[PDB]
Amino acid sequence: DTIRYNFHPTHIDTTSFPFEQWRKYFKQTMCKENHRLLLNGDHQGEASFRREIAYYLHHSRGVNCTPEQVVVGAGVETLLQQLFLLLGESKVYGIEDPGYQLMRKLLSHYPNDYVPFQVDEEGIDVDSIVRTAVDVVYTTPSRHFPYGSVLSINRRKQLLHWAEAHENRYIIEDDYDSEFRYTGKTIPSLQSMDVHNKVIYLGAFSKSLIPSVRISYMVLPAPLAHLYKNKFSYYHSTVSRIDQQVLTAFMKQGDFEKHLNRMRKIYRRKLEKVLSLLKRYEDKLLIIGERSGLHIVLVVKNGMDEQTLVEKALAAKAKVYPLSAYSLERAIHPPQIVLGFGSIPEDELEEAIATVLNAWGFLVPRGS
Amino acid sequence: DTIRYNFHPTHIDTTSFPFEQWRKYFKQTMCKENHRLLLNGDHQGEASFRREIAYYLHHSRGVNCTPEQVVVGAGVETLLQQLFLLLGESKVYGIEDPGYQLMRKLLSHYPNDYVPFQVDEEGIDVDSIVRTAVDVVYTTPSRHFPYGSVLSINRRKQLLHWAEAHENRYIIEDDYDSEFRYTGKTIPSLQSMDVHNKVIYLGAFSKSLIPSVRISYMVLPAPLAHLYKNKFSYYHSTVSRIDQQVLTAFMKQGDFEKHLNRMRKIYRRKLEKVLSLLKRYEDKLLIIGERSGLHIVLVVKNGMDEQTLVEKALAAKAKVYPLSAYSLERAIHPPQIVLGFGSIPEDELEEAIATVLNAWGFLVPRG
Ligand SMILES: [Ca+2]
Ligand SMILES: [Ca+2]
Ligand SMILES: [Ca+2]
Ligand SMILES: [Ca+2]
Ligand SMILES: [Cl-]
Ligand SMILES: [Cl-]
Numbered sequence: 001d002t003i004r005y006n007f008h009p010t011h012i013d014t015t016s017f018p019f020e021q022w023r024k025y026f027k028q029t030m031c032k033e034n035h036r037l038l039l040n041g042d043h044q045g046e047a048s049f050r051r052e053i054a055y056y057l058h059h060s061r062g063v064n065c066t067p068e069q070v071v072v073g074a075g076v077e078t079l080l081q082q083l084f085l086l087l088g089e090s091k092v093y094g095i096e097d098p099g100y101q102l103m104r105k106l107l108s109h110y111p112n113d114y115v116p117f118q119v120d121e122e123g124i125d126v127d128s129i130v131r132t133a134v135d136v137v138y139t140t141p142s143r144h145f146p147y148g149s150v151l152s153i154n155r156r157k158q159l160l161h162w163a164e165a166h167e168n169r170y171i172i173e174d175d176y177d178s179e180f181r182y183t184g185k186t187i188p189s190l191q192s193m194d195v196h197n198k199v200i201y202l203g204a205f206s207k208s209l210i211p212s213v214r215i216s217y218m219v220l221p222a223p224l225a226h227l228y229k230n231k232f233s234y235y236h237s238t239v240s241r242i243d244q245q246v247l248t249a250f251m252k253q254g255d256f257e258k259h260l261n262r263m264r265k266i267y268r269r270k271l272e273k274v275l276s277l278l279k280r281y282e283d284k285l286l287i288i289g290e291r292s293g294l295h296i297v298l299v300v301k302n303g304m305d306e307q308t309l310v311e312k313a314l315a316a317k318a319k320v321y322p323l324s325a326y327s328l329e330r331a332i333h334p335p336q337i338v339l340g341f342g343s344i345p346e347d348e349l350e351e352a353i354a355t356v357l358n359a360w361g362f363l364v365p366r367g368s
Numbered sequence: 369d370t371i372r373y374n375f376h377p378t379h380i381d382t383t384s385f386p387f388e389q390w391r392k393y394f395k396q397t398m399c400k401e402n403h404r405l406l407l408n409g410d411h412q413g414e415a416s417f418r419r420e421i422a423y424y425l426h427h428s429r430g431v432n433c434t435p436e437q438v439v440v441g442a443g444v445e446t447l448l449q450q451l452f453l454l455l456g457e458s459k460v461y462g463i464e465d466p467g468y469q470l471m472r473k474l475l476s477h478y479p480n481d482y483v484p485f486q487v488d489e490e491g492i493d494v495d496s497i498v499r500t501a502v503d504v505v506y507t508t509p510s511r512h513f514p515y516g517s518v519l520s521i522n523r524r525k526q527l528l529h530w531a532e533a534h535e536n537r538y539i540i541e542d543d544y545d546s547e548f549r550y551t552g553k554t555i556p557s558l559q560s561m562d563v564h565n566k567v568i569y570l571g572a573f574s575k576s577l578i579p580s581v582r583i584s585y586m587v588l589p590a591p592l593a594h595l596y597k598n599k600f601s602y603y604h605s606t607v608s609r610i611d612q613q614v615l616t617a618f619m620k621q622g623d624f625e626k627h628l629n630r631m632r633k634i635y636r637r638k639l640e641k642v643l644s645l646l647k648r649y650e651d652k653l654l655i656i657g658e659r660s661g662l663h664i665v666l667v668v669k670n671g672m673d674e675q676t677l678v679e680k681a682l683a684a685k686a687k688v689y690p691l692s693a694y695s696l697e698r699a700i701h702p703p704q705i706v707l708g709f710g711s712i713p714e715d716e717l718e719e720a721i722a723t724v725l726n727a728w729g730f731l732v733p734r735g
Binding site: 008011012014015017019022023026027030031032035036037038039040041074075077078081085101102105109111210211212213214231234235236237238239240241242243343 | 409611
């Protein structure tokens, strides 16, 4: 087949993107007067761009950093690799389970060991971490993937305390999941509470902007930033100067911020339509983390197993994501599926959900 | 200050670039109909783009590979890092001395050890390699930096033989420096001779095209390519899909090839003007590797040391490159300076060289 509907958690609404503006800024940047942009710039990122990042992160997340603490790289994986090299071979990493598997996967190639920790309604299990001899804790405190959990303000304090207790300890705050929250109290970055230079902040222009441009940023505590600038002095940027300059302009003249607001509205509509439809099956489908992100988790009580649910959906030309993809515990029961609605066009949402539900043997409204 | 003249060996003629065409292809690619390009593509590279790479490499260098053996990454450094992880922690690397320091520097972060080998008129010292217990040999056979040496056809055969002798051995062929040769025999890739899946081929769109776009490629022997696709299945591309698509088009419709020819002419003129001027001081300045690349080496007999020469040049706002920057084995005397003329505009060449010569206490023709 070709797959018709792709319920990917990290997809964006591609049809909505401001092509005209982007093209405009491209036109302004890529031209004879800016010919010097064709040579390589600062490895760490263009100063202009690092500046906008620090501005953006302050407004949006409460992050406090200088431009000289911002490292720009081609995707989160590029930056974590540099981080692993930077912090050294002895560090032991604690990671969330379940969660995105990237961190564990990358660590398989590096000397460093890892330890998984549970996440619950209040975030990562700080009690276990404290007993465990990890040095660096990787966590998504703002909204855990996939369930949407927030790291409670107590645990934030406890974790920062843990980090303060030793010179070797750090926290990696992953905010890959960009700022589409609709419900709950809006709570800031853990980095914003950090007064001890303990938190490394990680994010990307993927769920905002454009995933395929591969533009990501890591914010280092100022000692690490100095060490970074020394260790990696001879490297080159892994992100196009042209693209940096373009995004710099897009941000400076306010269009990025307009984009974000416009998209927030669109995603809100989509999510609400999706919930509107799914809430009708409340006996056999339970939704988790419904008021955050571009995706939800369904617990499915069809007596169909996880694998069956995936295959049936794929047969209907709809790709859906088994939660076991994101888990080291091999038993997930009842079966859970992640659905993301970024790429599903707004006017086809009902049809798309219908397709999946139908393939799963649910009764479906007309026009699918 | 700002530096007025930057004699960087890897710089290109930025003023010459086809902005209009590039912008055209950008316009064609980045638009509502191609909205799916905004999601991430194949980690290894866009199939269209890998295809053009395989085509390009065949016509230009005689490289024989499938698109599925081409890995696209953000600069040579990104790809070598993946390579180091792929081949494992036990491998020992041999590297050229002198040369670009990137390889040594990267290796400092990985478990892997390295050994430098001399380069002469005929390329890397294969005799030493054979005695040495290295597993992977890094070399720039087409045109060594900075002197311009070519790996002789004997040594090519000897090195491939060396590689054939053991299951663990490989050769990294760097063709970062590939396109601008004017003199000597135009000679093919070592990869083209490889029939034993021993050569990893490495190149980039920097000296052609645009350095700052950070688009590079590594061509893996087919067993390694299969291992790569498995080991790194979960990675994402480090190069923008949009930029891939743009360059894909630029290549397909022949604009890349036009670009290359146009640039070859320009660089040739610049080099010839530079030689024309410098040949006048043949007693105190000797030129090396003069008929290759976007740069030359000067041996300077001023009794000024290397450092002095650099500083004097920088005073008067010209940046020049000490050859010691490129060596692991012992201080060079008499001083050598690398001058690259990629970025120096054609109509300012005389002025620029004059600036440097003047600062070094030489007499200047035209006042
Ligand atoms: Ca490991
Ligand atoms: Ca959710
Ligand atoms: Ca090493
Ligand atoms: Ca890139
Ligand atoms: Cl063709
Ligand atoms: Cl110097």
